[PDB]
Design a protein around this ligand. Structure first.
Ligand SMILES: O=C(O)c1ccccc1O
Ligand SMILES: O=C(O)c1ccccc1O
Ligand SMILES: O=C(O)c1ccccc1O
Ligand SMILES: O=C(O)c1ccccc1O
Lengths: 215, 215
């Protein structure tokens, strides 16, 4: 069936950041290419996501999702690093920040339970980096106005940080801790590898967001 | 014990919008008034929130939470209405929008499962207002960039809409449907009505956010 004929609803898993990044250009393109398709999103749910992708309840997932392993396929959209972010007139924070100073200032922690970002707190702690967690929030999206009004600092994905800098008057430093890359991928389950609708929507994601040729 | 002595961690339930609104001024004030208190937040969870407030696992909840009834107390911070929001150069949407036009244009739906905002879809539908839901997302925070890049419209809390207008080039119309007020309240469970730490943090919320005298 041609894309214009499709009235299928595709269910897509992604974080708050992912929704702000992926949804505006996707829906813009869908209105031109397949205007009767419906999209619904949901936040990643580590308890349910694999099962939901196996059963076909969730069609695609986008983000840092290291648990989607055997039985899944992935295509790389881009990769980026964690950075330290803080307000631009912070009284003492500097770029490049020292590990000592990272460890002295107070933090907004981000739990990010159902994604690879949930690994950060344990990676720091096992390296023996103790942080004074003044505030802990579950997700990244509200970090910006919090850092603006305080002397707190945060460990944040670089592409999201860059989007926060001007609107909230923040700046960033390369991260002094050794943290892994953030690989942002498009995921699907092997059972839907040759489903024509899933294939078509995957190719659209690649066309709109893949930096394999770009960069 | 004096507030400077307190090292207590208070756990606070609020939406993404609530976190962006309440957390920056709260943490700013805490750094001046009670600098050793820790705060952690979480999103409202209708299955668990009442039980969690009864047991003392969640100290306070902020937002539109009509299920917190017998056994709870509430203080009004402010109230506001739903509005229609869309991009400022939308090719046909106008303010004041007609019910007919609301019903003709396509929508980004917001599920808002664990809050009173989860009532909107059913309230419209029972009034016989059928909407073409092109995109459905679980929460409000990412609505802004989506509306910017599309001809979609959305039913949104007015104070959040106003914050979106300039950064995302959107505008609003009074809502043509009959929808209830959005009462934004501070909630606590009766078991903690006279806990001195809970009382102190409630009074801070009232001082920072209550519009009872203001307005
Ligand atoms: O972490 C994500 O889920 C993400 C999604 C889109 C763009 C950048 C990101 O870090
Ligand atoms: O099966 C679908 O709904 C579909 C959607 C878009 C493109 C090709 C397709 O087969
Ligand atoms: O809906 C909310 O939870 C809310 C919170 C803060 C300010 C405005 C709001 O609508
Ligand atoms: O019990 C507390 O931790 C507390 C915190 C702030 C103010 C008064 C208090 O008793």
């Amino acid at each position: 069936m041609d894309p214009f004929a499709s009235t299928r609803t595709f269910n897509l898993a992604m974080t708050d950041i992912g929704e702000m990044y992926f949804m505006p250009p996707l829906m813009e393109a869908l209105a031109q290419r397949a205007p009767h398709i419906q999209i619904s999103t949901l936040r990643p749910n580590a308890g349910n996501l694999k099962e939901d992708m196996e059963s076909g309840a969730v069609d695609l997932a986008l983000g840092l999702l290291p648990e989607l392993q055997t039985g899944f396929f992935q295509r790389r959209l881009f990769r980026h690093r964690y950075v330290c972010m803080f307000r631009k007139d912070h009284p003492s924070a500097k770029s490049p920040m020292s590990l000592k100073q990272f460890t002295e200032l107070e933090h907004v922690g981000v739990v990010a339970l159902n994604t690879g970002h949930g690994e950060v707190d344990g990676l720091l702690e096992r390296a023996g980096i103790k942080r004074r967690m003044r505030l802990v929030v579950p997700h990244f999206i509200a970090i910006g106005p919090i850092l603006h009004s305080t002397d707190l600092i945060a460990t944040v994905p670089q592409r999201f940080a860059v989007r926060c800098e001007v609107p909230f008057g923040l700046t960033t430093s390369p991260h002094p801790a050794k943290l892994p890359d953030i690989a942002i991928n498009l995921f699907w389950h092997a059972k839907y590898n040759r489903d024509p609708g899933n294939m078509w929507l995957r190719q659209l994601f690649v066309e709109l967001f893949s930096e394999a040729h770009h960069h």
